[PDB]
Structure formats: C-alpha cells, structure tokens
Amino acid sequence: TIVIRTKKILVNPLLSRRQLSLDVLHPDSPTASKEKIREELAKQLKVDARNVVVYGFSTQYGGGKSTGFALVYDNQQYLLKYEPNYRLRKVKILGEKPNTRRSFKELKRKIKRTSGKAITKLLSEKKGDTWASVQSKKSDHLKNFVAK
Amino acid sequence: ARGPKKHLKRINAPKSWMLNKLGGIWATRPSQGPHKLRESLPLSVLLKERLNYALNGRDVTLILNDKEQNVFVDGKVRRDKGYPTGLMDVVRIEKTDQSFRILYDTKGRFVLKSLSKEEAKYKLLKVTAKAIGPNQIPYIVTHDSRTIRFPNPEIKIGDTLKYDLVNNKIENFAHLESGNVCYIQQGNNIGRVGIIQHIEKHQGSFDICHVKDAKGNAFATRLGNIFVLGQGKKSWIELPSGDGVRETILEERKRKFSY
Amino acid sequence: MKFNISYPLTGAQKCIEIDDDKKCNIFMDKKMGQEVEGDTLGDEFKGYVFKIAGGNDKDGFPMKQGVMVRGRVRLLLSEGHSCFTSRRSGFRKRKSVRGCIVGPDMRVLALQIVKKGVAEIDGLTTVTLPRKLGPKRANNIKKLFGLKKEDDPILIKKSVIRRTFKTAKGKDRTKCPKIQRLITPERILRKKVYKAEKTQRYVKTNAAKEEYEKFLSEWKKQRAAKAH
RNA sequence: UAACUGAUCGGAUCGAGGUUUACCUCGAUAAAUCAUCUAAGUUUCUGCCCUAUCAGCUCUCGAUGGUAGUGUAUUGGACUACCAUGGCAGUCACGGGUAACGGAGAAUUAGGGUUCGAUUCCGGAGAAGGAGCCUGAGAAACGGCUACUACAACUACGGUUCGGCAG
RNA sequence: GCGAAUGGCUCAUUAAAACAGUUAUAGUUUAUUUGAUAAUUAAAGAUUACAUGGAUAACCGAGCUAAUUGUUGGGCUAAUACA
Numbered sequence: 001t002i003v004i005r006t007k008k009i010l011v012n013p014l015l016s017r018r019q020l021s022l023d024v025l026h027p028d029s030p031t032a033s034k035e036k037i038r039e040e041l042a043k044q045l046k047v048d049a050r051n052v053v054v055y056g057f058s059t060q061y062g063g064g065k066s067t068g069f070a071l072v073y074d075n076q077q078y079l080l081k082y083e084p085n086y087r088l089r090k091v092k093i094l095g096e097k098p099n100t101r102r103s104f105k106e107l108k109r110k111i112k113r114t115s116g117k118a119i120t121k122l123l124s125e126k127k128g129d130t131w132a133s134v135q136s137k138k139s140d141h142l143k144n145f146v147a148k
Numbered sequence: 149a150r151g152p153k154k155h156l157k158r159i160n161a162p163k164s165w166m167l168n169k170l171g172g173i174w175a176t177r178p179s180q181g182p183h184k185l186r187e188s189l190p191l192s193v194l195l196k197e198r199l200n201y202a203l204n205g206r207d208v209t210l211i212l213n214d215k216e217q218n219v220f221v222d223g224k225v226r227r228d229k230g231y232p233t234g235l236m237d238v239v240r241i242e243k244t245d246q247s248f249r250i251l252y253d254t255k256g257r258f259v260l261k262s263l264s265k266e267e268a269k270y271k272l273l274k275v276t277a278k279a280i281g282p283n284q285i286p287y288i289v290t291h292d293s294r295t296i297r298f299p300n301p302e303i304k305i306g307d308t309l310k311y312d313l314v315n316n317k318i319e320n321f322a323h324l325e326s327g328n329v330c331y332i333q334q335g336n337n338i339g340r341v342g343i344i345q346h347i348e349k350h351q352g353s354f355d356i357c358h359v360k361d362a363k364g365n366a367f368a369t370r371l372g373n374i375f376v377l378g379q380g381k382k383s384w385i386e387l388p389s390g391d392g393v394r395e396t397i398l399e400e401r402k403r404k405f406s407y
Numbered sequence: 408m409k410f411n412i413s414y415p416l417t418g419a420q421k422c423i424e425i426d427d428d429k430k431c432n433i434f435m436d437k438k439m440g441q442e443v444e445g446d447t448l449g450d451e452f453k454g455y456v457f458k459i460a461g462g463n464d465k466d467g468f469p470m471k472q473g474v475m476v477r478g479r480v481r482l483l484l485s486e487g488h489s490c491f492t493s494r495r496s497g498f499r500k501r502k503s504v505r506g507c508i509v510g511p512d513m514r515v516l517a518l519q520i521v522k523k524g525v526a527e528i529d530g531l532t533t534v535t536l537p538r539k540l541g542p543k544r545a546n547n548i549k550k551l552f553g554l555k556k557e558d559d560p561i562l563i564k565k566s567v568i569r570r571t572f573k574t575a576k577g578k579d580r581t582k583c584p585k586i587q588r589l590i591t592p593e594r595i596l597r598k599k600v601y602k603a604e605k606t607q608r609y610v611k612t613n614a615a616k617e618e619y620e621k622f623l624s625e626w627k628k629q630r631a632a633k634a635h
Numbered sequence: 636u637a638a639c640u641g642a643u644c645g646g647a648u649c650g651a652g653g654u655u656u657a658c659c660u661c662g663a664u665a666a667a668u669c670a671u672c673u674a675a676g677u678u679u680c681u682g683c684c685c686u687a688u689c690a691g692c693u694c695u696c697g698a699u700g701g702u703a704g705u706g707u708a709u710u711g712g713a714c715u716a717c718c719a720u721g722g723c724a725g726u727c728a729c730g731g732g733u734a735a736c737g738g739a740g741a742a743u744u745a746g747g748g749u750u751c752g753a754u755u756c757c758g759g760a761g762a763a764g765g766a767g768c769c770u771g772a773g774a775a776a777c778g779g780c781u782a783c784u785a786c787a788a789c790u791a792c793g794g795u796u797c798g799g800c801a802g
Numbered sequence: 803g804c805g806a807a808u809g810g811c812u813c814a815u816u817a818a819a820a821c822a823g824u825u826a827u828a829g830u831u832u833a834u835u836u837g838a839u840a841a842u843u844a845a846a847g848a849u850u851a852c853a854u855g856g857a858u859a860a861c862c863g864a865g866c867u868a869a870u871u872g873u874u875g876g877g878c879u880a881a882u883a884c885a
C-alpha cells in the first residue's frame with residue numbers, strides 16, 4: 001500500500017491555495033505515479049482530484065521513500081488562473097506548445113524589412129498560440145467542469 | 149561607465165537577504181525608493197524567501213499585479229516587485245491581516261516582526277534634517293524619506309518620532325541623549341539594542357556613541373547608526389526575540405544545547 | 408522623358424511619356440517649384456499650367472529642394488529633411504541626392520496642374536475621388552458641417568459621418584469615428600475636481616498654519632511659566 | 636529693497652465603479668521646486684614588479700604659483716592675457732622594460748618565504764587603427780552616425796550596404 | 803512614449819597611471835523611485851474655458867532605380883504629437 005505523510009503545510013490565501021511538502025512511503029514498490037499520490041492525498045484532505053497539483057518528486061536511494069510537493073487550490077477557478085501553462089498540459093487541459101523560435105525570428109526578419117500593410121499581412125500568418133486562445137480554452141474548460 | 153546599472157548578481161546581493169549561493173546568477177535589484185539599496189529588503193524577497201507565499205518569480209508577479217491589492221507598506225499599497233521596504237517599515241498583507249515590522253536581528257539578517265493591531269498603527273521615524281521651508285514654514289525630514297511639516301519645535305535633529313500611520317500625526321518623540329534606548333541600524337554592532345552611555349563629538353568628521361545592554365556589555369558606533377527606541381529603558385517597539393542582546397557563541401551553545 | 412502628373416482637386420494621378428528632345432527642351436534648366444506653360448509640350452496640353460514639384464534620376468534619386476545644382480550631390484541628412492528617415496533619435500546619413508535643376512539625366516518629373524486649359528486629358532476631368540475619413544475633432548466637425556459654436560454637443564454627435572461597407576466575406580457592416588475634443592460630463596467633472604484639489608491645498612495649509620500658531624502660543628505660555 | 640529675463644513652472648490629458656445620471660468614490664499620466672533614493676564626475680591620505688649599459692628632470696608657449704577673465708555640471712594652467720621663477724629629484728626624480736590590466740584571490744607552505752592571478756565578484760579600459768559627432772537624464776556609445784588609414788559585401792559601373800565574431 | 807548607456811565579450815593600452823582601503827563635494831550632475839510643496843497664469847498683444855489652432859503617419863492613389871529597413875510627388879483624418 002501507499003502511505004502518505006503530509007509534512008510542511010503553508011496556508012496561502014494570497015494565491016488561495018495550500019502549499020505542501022509530501023512524503024510517500026512505498027516500501028515494496030516502485031516510485032508512485034502522480035495519479036495515485038494525488039488520489040491518496042485528496043482522500044486524506046477531502047478535496048477534489050483536479051483541485052490538487054502534485055509536483056517535483058524525489059525517490060531516495062534504496063527505494064522506500066519519495067519526497068514531493070503538492071498544491072491544493074480552494075476552487076478550480078483559482079487553480080485554473082494560477083498554475084502556468086506547461087502544467088495545464090501535464091493535466092491535459094491545454095495543448096502543445098508548438099515550435100516558436102524559428103518562425104518568430106524569420107517573422108522578425110521580414111517585419112523589420114518592410115512597412116505597415118505588408119507587416120500586418122505577415123502578422124496574420126504568425127505561428128503563435130495566442131494569449132486570447134489560451135484564456136479561451138481556459139474559460140471553456142471552466143465551463144465544462146462539474147463540482148465533485 | 150556609460151550611466152546607470154540596472155542589474156544585480158546573486159553573489160553581490162547583501163548577506164542580510166540570505167539568498168542561496170547556487171540559486172541563480174542574478175537576484176532582484178532593489179528599486180529606487182525610501183531606503184538605500186543595501187538597507188533595502190525588496191518585496192520580491194519578502195514574499196518569495198521569507199513568507200514563502202510566492203514559490204517563484206511568476207508567483208510574485210501574480211501577487212503584485214492581482215487587481216485585489218495584496219500588499220501594504222506604511223499603509224500605502226505597493227505593486228512594485230523591487231520596492232525597497234526598509235528599517236522600521238510596517239508591511240501588512242491584506243488577505244491574512246498579517247502585520248510585520250522590518251528589522252535586523254543581532255546577526256544582521258532581515259526579520260519580519262509579527263505585530264498585533266495596536267503596534268501596526270505606529271511606526272518609528274528618525275529625524276534626518278530640520279529646516280525652515282518656503283513661506284517660512286518649519287520642516288523636518290526622516291530616514292524613510294518623509295517630509296514632515298510644522299513639527300513640534302522642540303524636535304531636534306536625529307531624534308525619533310513615534311508616528312501614527314492612520315492619522316499621519318507625530319505622537320511622541322525622544323532625542324539622542326544619555327539614557328535613552330537604541331537599536332543600531334548599521335554596523336558590526338547591527339541589531340544590538342541599548343542604553344546610551346554618552347556621546348563624543350570629534351567635529352572633524354564622525355561622532356561616536358557608546359551603549360550598554362541589559363546584560364551590561366558596552367558598544368560603540370558612529371552617530372549615524374544609532375536609532376532611538378523611546379525614553380527610559382523602555383522601547384516603543386516589540387523587538388525580534390533576542391530582545392536586542394547579543395549572545396556569545398558560548399552563551400548560544402550553552403542555552404540552546406545545554407552545555 | 409516621363410512625367411508623373413498629379414492634380415489636387417479630383418485627386419487625379421496619371422503619368423505620361425514623351426520621347427521628343429524638342430518637346431522636353433522646355434523643362435531644361437528650370438529649378439523645381441517653377442511654373443511651366445503646358446502649350447509648348449503637346450497639343451493635349453494647350454493652355455495648361457504646371458508646377459515642377461520634384462522628380463527622379465535615372466538611378467532613382469529624388470530631387471531635394473534648395474539644393475541648387477544639376478545632377479547628384481552627397482549630403483549629410485539630419486532629421487526633418489526630405490529624402491531621409493531617422494532610424495534613431497540623433498540620426499544622420501550620407502545620402503546621394505538629385506539637385507533642383509532639371510537636366511536630361513532625369514527620367515522622371517513630378518507635375519502639379521495649376522491652371523488647366525481647354526484641352527481635356529481623361530483622368531483629370533473624368534474622375535472624382537471620394538471622401539473617406541470625415542472630420543474627427545469636435546470643432547472640425549462643427550466647422551466643416553457648418554454648426555454654431557454656442558451649439559449643443561449632441562448636435563455634433565448626430566452630425567458625425569457614418570461609414571457603411573461590405574466585408575470581403577460578403578457581410579454588411581457600419582463603422583463610426585470617435586470625437587476627440589468633445590465636451591462631455593466627464594471632462595467637466597475632472598476640471599471641477601482639480602480646482603477642488605487647489606482650493607484644498609491652500610485651505611489645509613492655512614488651517615495647519617493657524618493650528619501650529621495657537622499651539623505655539625500655548626506652549627510658550629507653559630514654557631515661560633516654567634521659568635519663574 | 637531695487638530692477639532684469641520671459642528661454643522656468645503655475646493640467647485644453649486619460650480610466651474605473653457607481654448609489655439613477657447630476658452627483659459621488661477610487662485610480663492612470665504629464666510636469667516645476669526641495670528633499671530622497673540610484674549612479675556618475677571630480678577628490679584627500681597611503682600602498683605597485685625589473686632597470687643607473689636611465690642622473691638630472693619640467694619651462695617657446697604651462698612647467699610651479701599669483702591675478703582678472705573664459706569655459707564647464709561643477710573645482711582647477713582645464714584654457715587665455717598679464718606677472719613671478721618656480722615644481723620634482725640618491726627617502727631614485729626623469730627615462731627604459733614588463734611574454735603588466737589592479738584588486739577579491741590561487742599553488743606551495745614548520746616558521747619567515749617563494750611564485751602566480753587573461754578568466755565567476757568589484758573597479759578600469761576597448762569594439763580593426765585614429766579622430767569627430769548626433770540624441771539623450773546618462774555616450775565620445777560602437778550590435779549609433781561622419782571622415783581618413785587598412786580592410787568586408789552587392790553593382791547592369793553610376794551606384795549601394797541594418798559592413799565591423801575582443802556577444 | 804520608453805528602452806536601446808544595462809547586460810554579454812576581451813585584456814591591447816596602463817607603473818602613482820588604473821586599482822585598493824580611507825576621505826572630500828561647503829566644487830557638481832542625475833531619466834525612472836519615495837516624501838513634501840504649490841491662492842497670483844509677467845508686460846504688449848491676445849483672451850472660448852461647457853475647452854483654442856493649424857498640420858502629418860498609417861490608409862487610398864500615382865512613381866523612380868539593376869540594386870538596399872531608399873524614398874519622390876498627390877488625396878485623407880487623430881492625438882499626452884506640434885502650437
């Protein structure tokens with residue numbers, strides 16, 4: 001079985017979450033997948049699964065333990081407003097970050113070297129995943145949510 | 149050197165912040181403000197390192213750009229990540245109603261002194277200059293860069309006013325003389341607290357004062373680093389708990405580990 | 408030689424070719440910003456008056472005005488010059504420019520119709536270019552729309568031009584400009600509040616001054632009564 | 636208290652929430668003076684390796700000082716006019732050399748030493764070589780311009796380059 | 803508007819020079835920060851304050867070069883721009 005000692009607990013109203021250090025004891029088993037650690041933690045603290053973010057796990061040498069960290073947001077509204085985007089992808093909420101640099105710098109090339117009309121015509125074609133689209137997928141996912 | 153320097157490297161950031169040697173290249177360069185760069189504790193460190201309310205950079209930004217107005221210094225809102233919260237300032241976090249005072253402990257690192265509500269109204273101010281202003285209006289200036297008008301005329305230079313931050317009205321004051329209580333803002337004697345024995349003026353340059361504490365160890369420091377804590381043996385502030393008495397490492401080890 | 412002919416009212420622009428050395432003898436050694444009879448050019452130009460507004464070299468070089476020489480000269484162009492664009496604040500460049508004086512080395516001349524004669528060239532008379540971008544500023548509306556100064560702001564509101572157009576998608580849409588300078592309640596409020604700030608300044612200062620004064624006299628009464 | 640200049644400033648700018656809307660409550664920003672922060676310019680005292688096959692040095696336009704100016708952000712021979720004859724040197728001047736940027740430091744170390752520090756930090760300097768500028772609060776900027784010396788890229792030869800790896 | 807004067811690179815120059823530790827600025831400059839001030843808008847002229855005036859870019863339209871982040875003429879309208 002998985003035991004979870006919950007260690008250092010800071011109540012953070014500012015970001016409206018609880019910050020957590022975690023100790024997982026898995027004496028007979030491989031390092032615990034985050035799905036399981038999430039679920040066991042939620043079982044302990046009575047909150048929703050998708051209200052808890054679990055991160056940064058270190059199994060020690062010899063394999064009885066892992067130490068990790070957790071976050072529990074008050075509402076998934078906040079959680080959806082605070083966690084950064086690569087994390088929302090780990091949780092499948094957001095998407096892929098496509099290849100930015102190359103595009104952006106060749107666009108920089110062409111943009112610098114012409115004037116307004118053409119510039120706008122290039123900007124229409126930019127490969128970016130817009131901040132608009134981000135907040136849109138966030139809101140939409142907040143609209144597809146069901147409270148526990 | 150072509151003008152102003154906009155960066156700060158972690159190795160060069162003051163020891164008082166207790167930053168990790170290995171934590172990065174840069175640290176946060178304190179903003180121009182009420183306090184000097186070396187006497188600054190910036191907000192970003194106040195939140196990230198001390199309170200741990202912010203885990204990283206992004207987080208700090210979140211707190212200080214959130215429409216909700218989370219952090220207060222001397223009653224006034226601050227949204228600037230590098231705002232130089234200095235000595236004697238009262239920083240207050242609206243969400244938890246935590247009210248802290250910015251201080252140095254005997255080891256010269258920055259500390260947040262938890263204050264109850266009655267403490268948090270008051271803040272200690274130290275007179276820098278005293279002049280007649282325009283229109284023949286007497287004025288006074290403070291370490292936190294206040295300018296105070298129509299001061300009580302008895303107030304001399306280098307005194308300590310007790311300032312009501314609700315009323316913006318100086319309440320009581322005391323000056324630098326034999327027999328008052330000090331805190332020491334800068335020195336190898338930084339953080340120590342004591343009764344002024346006397347003051348010697350050398351008049352070319354630098355005037356030195358001597359100090360005692362509750363235990364009876366003498367100190368000395370230049371006048372500039374003395375900050376007055378009230379009249380008598382009583383201080384108008386709740387001190388971080390050393391009470392302002394330095395401990396020999398022998399004393400430290402004894403009391404801590406029972407040797 | 409090639410002539411780019413623009414005329415201001417219609418907003419007419421056409422450009423013309425003349426291979427006659429004899430026909431182009433006229434503009435030779437005429438400085439820019441000069442008046443030309445159109446007659447000596449061609450028959451369709453009978454009765455025409457042109458202003459020589461500029462031109463271009465064989466190599467593309469435009470003529471700067473006031474540079475008086477025929478052919479190219481190199482200059483140091485600071486900001487606020489023709490032929491120039493500042494990439495940066497203080498910016499200067501060595502540039503090759505064409506002089507004011509028209510030689511055969513010029514491929515192109517820019518011509519401004521001043522007085523059009525009897526002769527009728529198609530694109531001068533044929534065209535009427537529309538009015539896009541009506542007036543924006545409040546007062547400019549009032550003027551160009553013929554309204555009184557004493558008049559109500561809502562009359563300015565109601566008289567602003569509408570734009571109506573068909574989207575490339577085939578949609579039907581209408582766009583309106585915003586009036587700048589407009590007198591609204593908000594402007595007046597802000598004004599009232601600023602004047603308030605002032606009056607508060609000297610009021611508060613006065614009250615302080617008097618508070619200090621009376622406290623003073625009390626304190627000296629105590630101070631001197633401590634002396635005896 | 637005289638006058639003087641008008642080439643200082645003395646808000647024709649923006650949001651938001653609203654008590655239902657003719658009035659409140661929060662803010663954004665522009666800018667002058669004085670403090671304050673930040674940084675700089677200059678600046679006091681003291682301290683560098685080898686060399687005498689360097690013993691005198693500096694002063695025809697500044698060498699040391701004095702005067703009026705001028706210039707500068709300011710002080711000053713910083714610069715000018717006049718005046719004086721000083722200023723430094725065996726306690727090493729002046730002049731060479733350095734496969735010399737200075738420190739924080741590094742390798743060795745009984746003790747005393749020896750030998751390194753181009754290189755994480757702080758100063759200083761430079762952007763191929765020299766000079767000169769623009770604009771700024773700050774620049775002699777160099778991922779700014781002008782010229783020359785020496786070079787780099789296009790050219791239809793007439794022209795051109797957002798030409799400068801000690802990023 | 804603001805920034806581009808930080809950062810990054812290199813050690814060629816440099817022997818009281820730079821640098822270091824100690825000072826002075828009562829001999830100065832400082833954009834952005836924090837605090838505090840502000841009753842008179844010189845005179846002549848002008849004077850609407852329920853708020854003044856003329857322009858220009860983007861845009862539309864016509865061009866020049868073999869050539870570039872070159873720009874030339876023409877028609878429009880904003881500003882916390884310029885008065």
Ligand SMILES: [Mg+2]
Nearest residue numbers: 084085086097
């Ligand atoms: Mg991202």
Ligand SMILES: [Mg+2]
Nearest residue numbers: 179228229230
């Ligand atoms: Mg900042």
Ligand SMILES: [Mg+2]
Nearest residue numbers: 351352353354
């Ligand atoms: Mg002094």
Ligand SMILES: [Mg+2]
Nearest residue numbers: 593651652653
């Ligand atoms: Mg409203």
Ligand SMILES: [Mg+2]
Nearest residue numbers: 684735751752
């Ligand atoms: Mg050496």
Ligand SMILES: [Mg+2]
Nearest residue numbers: 756757758759
């Ligand atoms: Mg360096």
Ligand SMILES: [Mg+2]
Nearest residue numbers: 675758759821
């Ligand atoms: Mg220095």
Ligand SMILES: [Mg+2]
Nearest residue numbers: 800801802811
């Ligand atoms: Mg390289």
Ligand SMILES: [Mg+2]
Nearest residue numbers: 730731732817
């Ligand atoms: Mg030498």
Ligand SMILES: [Mg+2]
Nearest residue numbers: 679680681818
């Ligand atoms: Mg010296």
Ligand SMILES: [Mg+2]
Nearest residue numbers: 858876877878
């Ligand atoms: Mg025009």
